[PDB]
Write an enzyme that holds these catalytic residues in place. Structure first.
Site, PDB file in Angstrom:
ATOM      1  N   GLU A 423      -5.902 -19.936   8.496  1.00 36.30           N
ATOM      2  CA  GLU A 423      -5.205 -18.921   9.301  1.00 36.30           C
ATOM      3  C   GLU A 423      -4.308 -18.138   8.328  1.00 36.30           C
ATOM      4  O   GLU A 423      -3.124 -17.916   8.539  1.00 36.30           O
ATOM      5  CB  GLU A 423      -4.515 -19.708  10.441  1.00 36.30           C
ATOM      6  CG  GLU A 423      -3.367 -19.152  11.253  1.00 36.30           C
ATOM      7  CD  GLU A 423      -2.495 -20.195  11.975  1.00 36.30           C
ATOM      8  OE1 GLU A 423      -1.990 -19.866  13.070  1.00 36.30           O
ATOM      9  OE2 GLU A 423      -2.254 -21.311  11.460  1.00 36.30           O
ATOM     10  N   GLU A 432      -2.724 -11.377   2.542  1.00 37.56           N
ATOM     11  CA  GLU A 432      -2.007 -12.614   2.217  1.00 37.56           C
ATOM     12  C   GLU A 432      -2.716 -13.455   1.159  1.00 37.56           C
ATOM     13  O   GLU A 432      -2.232 -14.525   0.835  1.00 37.56           O
ATOM     14  CB  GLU A 432      -1.750 -13.418   3.481  1.00 37.56           C
ATOM     15  CG  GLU A 432      -1.113 -12.572   4.581  1.00 37.56           C
ATOM     16  CD  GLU A 432      -0.824 -13.319   5.862  1.00 37.56           C
ATOM     17  OE1 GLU A 432      -1.336 -14.457   6.062  1.00 37.56           O
ATOM     18  OE2 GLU A 432       0.072 -12.844   6.631  1.00 37.56           O
TER      19      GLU A 432
HETATM   20  C1  LIG Z   1       0.395 -20.348   9.474  1.00 33.47           C
HETATM   21  S1  LIG Z   1       0.628 -18.990   8.386  1.00 33.47           S
HETATM   22  C2  LIG Z   1      -0.407 -19.436   7.047  1.00 33.47           C
HETATM   23  C3  LIG Z   1      -0.017 -20.723   6.323  1.00 33.47           C
HETATM   24  O1  LIG Z   1      -0.533 -20.859   4.987  1.00 33.47           O
HETATM   25  C4  LIG Z   1       0.243 -21.495   4.024  1.00 33.47           C
HETATM   26  N1  LIG Z   1      -0.384 -21.210   2.740  1.00 33.47           N
HETATM   27  C5  LIG Z   1      -0.626 -20.008   2.201  1.00 33.47           C
HETATM   28  N2  LIG Z   1      -1.217 -20.147   0.987  1.00 33.47           N
HETATM   29  C6  LIG Z   1      -1.347 -21.462   0.764  1.00 33.47           C
HETATM   30  C7  LIG Z   1      -1.902 -22.305  -0.308  1.00 33.47           C
HETATM   31  N3  LIG Z   1      -2.437 -21.730  -1.407  1.00 33.47           N
HETATM   32  N4  LIG Z   1      -1.864 -23.648  -0.142  1.00 33.47           N
HETATM   33  C8  LIG Z   1      -1.342 -24.233   0.971  1.00 33.47           C
HETATM   34  N5  LIG Z   1      -0.809 -23.515   1.985  1.00 33.47           N
HETATM   35  C9  LIG Z   1      -0.800 -22.160   1.932  1.00 33.47           C
HETATM   36  C10 LIG Z   1       1.549 -20.835   4.245  1.00 33.47           C
HETATM   37  O2  LIG Z   1       2.611 -21.646   3.744  1.00 33.47           O
HETATM   38  C11 LIG Z   1       1.447 -20.717   5.751  1.00 33.47           C
HETATM   39  O3  LIG Z   1       2.136 -21.795   6.393  1.00 33.47           O
HETATM   40  N1  LIG Z   2      -0.983 -15.805   8.414  1.00 33.71           N
HETATM   41  C1  LIG Z   2      -0.485 -14.955   9.414  1.00 33.71           C
HETATM   42  N2  LIG Z   2      -0.106 -13.721   9.107  1.00 33.71           N
HETATM   43  C2  LIG Z   2       0.388 -12.852  10.001  1.00 33.71           C
HETATM   44  C3  LIG Z   2       0.884 -11.481   9.939  1.00 33.71           C
HETATM   45  C4  LIG Z   2       1.259 -11.141  11.189  1.00 33.71           C
HETATM   46  N3  LIG Z   2       1.032 -12.178  12.044  1.00 33.71           N
HETATM   47  C5  LIG Z   2       0.505 -13.231  11.352  1.00 33.71           C
HETATM   48  C6  LIG Z   2       0.108 -14.509  11.727  1.00 33.71           C
HETATM   49  C7  LIG Z   2      -0.380 -15.362  10.753  1.00 33.71           C
HETATM   50 BR1  LIG Z   2      -0.884 -17.066  11.324  1.00 33.71          BR
END
Ligand SMILES: CSC[C@H]1O[C@@H](n2cnc3c(N)ncnc32)[C@H](O)[C@@H]1O
Ligand SMILES: Nc1nc2cc[nH]c2cc1Br
Lengths: 625, 296
Positions: A423, A432
């Site tokens: 997600e 992201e």
């Molecule tokens: C629920 S929003 C997406 C989630 O991904 C986690 N996340 C993003 N990139 C990584 C990664 N490389 N390893 C573990 N968790 C991650 C973030 O800390 C976030 O909680």
């Molecule tokens: N990883 C996420 N990114 C965004 C950006 C806006 N809403 C989000 C929810 C999640 Br889960």
């Protein structure tokens, strides 16, 4: 709550007029500040030495009434663009005099006409005023949808009104506005008071004002039709326009005399109020998103940053999104483990980026629904969120869930995964860095394993909003490039804007990425056909994702998942607005770029004119790996 | 009586009608005054009749001998009438039909009808008896600066405007208006010649125009020509007023004969006595009623 004003050019007793107007239901009164026939000489004797007082006293109302209840009006004899030099000079002095008097009173807004093409010297003098004193009055530029010349009765025998469509010609009053605000350097204090005629123009003429800073809509009494009980109403076409303006939260100004002479004046207002009650009420997305209309925010970077508790609370408040995720794992578990294997075959599920555990709970709910056994790993790099997970794991989940406080690209997994569930998607899908994260997690997906999401694809579309262009422009900061604000995306609930072509897909990423020679850098060219005259200020960005098979999520407006509100659209601005004529192609070029440390977007418009490449080498904006 | 004198017109018996606005200070109203003794004007306590209107007087005109047609700031065209004694002035009607300041008014030849022009861009034809708008014309694209009824033809009149059109009207045609340089500000029909009129422009030029074929013209004033008033003589003189704060009387060929810098503010109306054709009366925003002895 329709905020409503009364336009008058006749105010004999200021307090009595205001009092009658207040009893009628109006929130404010537009009125002249000097008498509108009281023409004043500044150069030539003997009239330059006319004994004062030159107008009414500021003592006639309270400071509070001047600040809240009174909109000033430029005197209609003030012509700073007159062909006569002396009218030019007297009008200059008189304009500054009237503006400065409105500022002396502390009036919240002041009205000025655009009623001809050349308002160049009017703009200059308004700019002179704007840079004189520290005040913050709004300037409402009174401009009609249709110029008087183009709505005139066809009654001059030897000067017939044109019976041909003139597409650009019928939009001329937009160009009056555009040229005015361009000359005045797109000041935040200069807005539109759009004046509606009895006969609306073609839709394209109205559409032209999309994304413009419309603070007021002026409604003449003459435009109101009469219904069978004698009272004022409007045509269904005009009602359409009112409903759009209500969505912009404009202040409605009633101008001209009472022609509906049977009923009380309230009537005109009561109709607007009647219309205001009988719109379709705000949908649960539009209820959730109230307040955020055209509010620019930084895109969240959950990789680079550790997200706050409340940010996760917001993510978790979207039950449509999780019932979709649940459904995708449900359908997947069935496809992987047959009925006869259900007790032999425990599927290794890995939630990659587990946050505070909504996908973990969706995985549990899906497995009990599917009637198949699962072994859960909840991998989360944010150690604050891991506290929530581990408290959840001790209190509720137990040994079934193993919490892993690690980066997915570092984690040495004890076994391979049947399904990886994640997600990691922002408003542009990949912003992201889901591609890079899932790529480094890929070595512990089983040879036959599934990623949920399996796929996702970003979409872009060119937009016009002079409002949003101004919002971006106002994000200039100290100690950085004075144009860096134009070279970065913003998450924004786009509202006062015009989508100028249908969205098209930009970048796609598929998981697992079986391709031997991996690269998440991209270069895309999009050609957007444009059917309108307009001004390009940026590119709205959306996305779509395949969780599993037909189970999808989207924020692309045309395929938008109903009820989903976790993401708003992204916006890529440009530095200089681009004129786009009807039938031209907008060509945009987008790059996704990277080094070991950062990922970023670069972009450029190449047609109908070249922009600079924006965010070259991530100088203004990077996404942390 | 309010400071800013806007109008001054004689009736048949030499009695002077004044119109005034307060264009500054607290109260922005107007008023209507009859002086049976002209030389007493502007003086309030030694006059025949007077009344308060609700709003300012932009223009007025006599309706024969007892009626007073008024162009209001309110949007009203107003008819006031003298009583049986001519010591009171009573409103017969006040009809709010224009959407902005009514700037100009003119009674048509017959005297049963009139024409009004406004800032709202419209020209309206009125039935003075029935107290209704017969016709409403949006021919212009900007403020209607002046309308002037044809002396002898009830269906004919001139209008001019800030869109730079002088329109010759004729209600008998399906398309009544016909279009005939700096903006036209004032209009006067020639009293003896049906086919001829004069127009003053905002740059201080008076121009003489035949309906068949800006032909002859003179630079009379340094600023805008507010009003043009032909004299009652058989061989008539043309009075010309301006924002330059000066009266000029002109001949057939627009040559300068008389010149008065008596007014210290803008000169707003002129009116020739029907008792003495050589006396010409002006009024101005300096609250002066100046009686000029024109060398005729
Ligand atoms: C629920 S929003 C997406 C989630 O991904 C986690 N996340 C993003 N990139 C990584 C990664 N490389 N390893 C573990 N968790 C991650 C973030 O800390 C976030 O909680
Ligand atoms: N990883 C996420 N990114 C965004 C950006 C806006 N809403 C989000 C929810 C999640 Br889960």
């Amino acid at each position: 709550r329709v905020s409503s004003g009364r336009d008058l050019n006749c105010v004999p007793e200021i307090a009595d007029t205001l009092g009658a107007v207040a009893k009628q239901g109006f929130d404010f009164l537009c009125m002249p500040v000097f008498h509108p026939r009281f023409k004043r000489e500044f150069i030539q004797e003997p009239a330059k030495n006319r004994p004062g007082p030159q107008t009414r006293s500021d003592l006639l109302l309270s400071g509070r009434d001047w600040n809240t209840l009174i909109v000033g009006k430029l005197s209609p004899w003030i012509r700073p663009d007159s062909k006569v030099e002396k009218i030019r000079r007297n009008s200059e002095a008189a304009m500054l005099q009237e503006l400065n008097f409105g500022a002396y009173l502390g009036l919240p807004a002041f009205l000025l006409p655009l009623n001809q093409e050349d308002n160049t010297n009017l703009a200059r003098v308004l700019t002179n005023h704007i840079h004189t004193g520290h005040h913050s009055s709004m300037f409402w530029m009174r401009v009609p949808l249709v110029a008087p010349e183009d709505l005139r009765d066809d009654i001059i025998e030897n000067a017939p009104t044109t019976h041909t469509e003139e597409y650009s010609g019928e939009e001329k009053t937009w160009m009056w506005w555009h040229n005015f605000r361009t000359l005045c350097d797109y000041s935040k204090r200069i807005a539109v008071a759009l004046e509606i005629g009895a006969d609306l123009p073609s839709n394209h003429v109205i559409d032209r004002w999309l994304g413009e800073p419309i603070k007021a809509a002026i409604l003449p009494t003459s435009i109101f039709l009469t219904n069978k009980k004698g009272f004022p109403v409007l045509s269904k076409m005009h009602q359409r326009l009112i409903f759009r303006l209500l969505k912009l939260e404009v202040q409605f100004i009633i101008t001209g005399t009472n022609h509906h002479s049977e009923k009380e004046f309230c009537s005109y207002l009561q109709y607007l109020e009647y219309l205001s009650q009988n719109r379709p009420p705000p949908n649960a997305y539009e209820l959730f998103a109230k307040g955020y209309e055209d509010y620019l925010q930084s895109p969240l970077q959950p990789l680079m940053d550790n997200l706050e508790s409340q940010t996760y609370e917001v993510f978790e408040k979207d039950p449509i999104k999780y019932s979709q995720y649940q459904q995708a794992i449900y359908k997947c578990l069935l496809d992987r483990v047959p009925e006869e294997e259900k007790d032999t075959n425990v599927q290794v599920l890995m939630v990659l980026g587990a946050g505070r555990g909504p996908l973990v709970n969706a995985s549990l709910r899906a497995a009990k629904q599917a009637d198949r056994r699962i072994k859960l790993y909840a991998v989360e790099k944010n150690p604050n969120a891991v506290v929530t997970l581990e408290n959840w794991q001790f209190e509720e989940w137990g040994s079934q869930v193993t919490v892993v406080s690690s980066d997915m690209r570092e984690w040495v997994a004890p076994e391979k995964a049947d399904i990886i569930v994640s997600e990691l998607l922002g408003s542009f899908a990949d912003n992201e860095l889901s591609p890079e994260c899932l790529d480094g997690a890929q070595h512990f997906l089983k040879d036959d394993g599934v990623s949920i999401p399996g796929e996702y694809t970003s979409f872009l579309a060119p937009i016009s909003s002079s409002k949003l262009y101004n919002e971006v422009r106002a994000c200039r900061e100290k100690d950085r490039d004075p144009e860096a604000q134009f070279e970065m995306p913003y998450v924004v609930r786009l509202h006062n804007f015009h989508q100028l072509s249908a969205p098209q897909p930009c970048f796609t990423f598929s998981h697992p990425n079986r391709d031997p020679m991996i690269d998440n850098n991209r270069y895309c060219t999009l050609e957007f056909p444009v059917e309108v005259n307009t001004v390009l200020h940026g590119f709205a960005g959306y996305f779509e994702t395949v969780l599993y098979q037909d189970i999808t999520l989207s924020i692309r407006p045309e395929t938008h998942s109903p009820g989903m509100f976790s993401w708003f659209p992204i916006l890529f601005p440009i530095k200089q607005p681009i004129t786009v004529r009807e039938g031209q192609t907008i060509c945009v070029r987008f790059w996704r770029c990277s080094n070991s440390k950062k990922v970023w977007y670069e972009w450029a418009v190449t047609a109908p004119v070249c922009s600079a490449i924006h965010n070259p080498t991530g100088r203004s904006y990077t996404i942390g790996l | 009586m309010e400071r800013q004198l806007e109008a001054a017109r004689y009736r048949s018996d030499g009695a002077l009608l004044l119109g005034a606005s307060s264009l500054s200070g607290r109260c922005w109203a107007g008023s209507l005054w009859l002086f049976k003794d002209p030389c007493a004007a502007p003086n309030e306590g030694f006059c025949s009749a007077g009344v308060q209107t609700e709003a300012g007087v932009a223009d007025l005109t006599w309706v024969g001998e007892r009626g007073i047609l008024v162009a209001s700031d309110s949007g009203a065209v107003e008819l006031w009438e003298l009583d049986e004694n001519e010591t009171l002035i009573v409103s017969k009607f006040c009809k709010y039909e224009h959407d902005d300041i009514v700037s100009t008014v003119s009674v048509l030849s017959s005297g049963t009808q009139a024409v009004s022009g406004s800032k709202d861009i419209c020209i309206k034809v009125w039935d003075l008896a029935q107290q209704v708008v017969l016709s409403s014309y949006r021919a212009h694209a900007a403020q209607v600066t002046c309308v002037a009824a044809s002396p002898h033809k009830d269906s004919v009149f001139l209008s001019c405007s800030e869109d730079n059109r002088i329109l010759l009207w004729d209600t008998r045609c399906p398309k009544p208006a016909s279009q005939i340089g700096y903006l036209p500000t004032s209009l006067a029909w020639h009293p003896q010649q049906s086919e001829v009129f004069v127009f003053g422009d905002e740059n201080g030029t008076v121009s003489l125009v035949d309906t068949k074929s800006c032909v002859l013209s003179s630079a009379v004033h340094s600023q805008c020509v507010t009003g043009l008033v032909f004299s009652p003589h058989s061989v008539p003189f043309l009075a010309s007023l301006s924002e330059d704060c000066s009266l000029a009387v002109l001949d057939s060929s627009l040559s300068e004969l008389f010149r008065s810098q008596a007014h210290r503010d803008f000169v707003r109306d002129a009116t020739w006595s029907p008792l003495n054709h050589s006396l010409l009366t002006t009024v101005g925003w300096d609250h002066q009623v100046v009686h000029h002895v024109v060398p005729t």
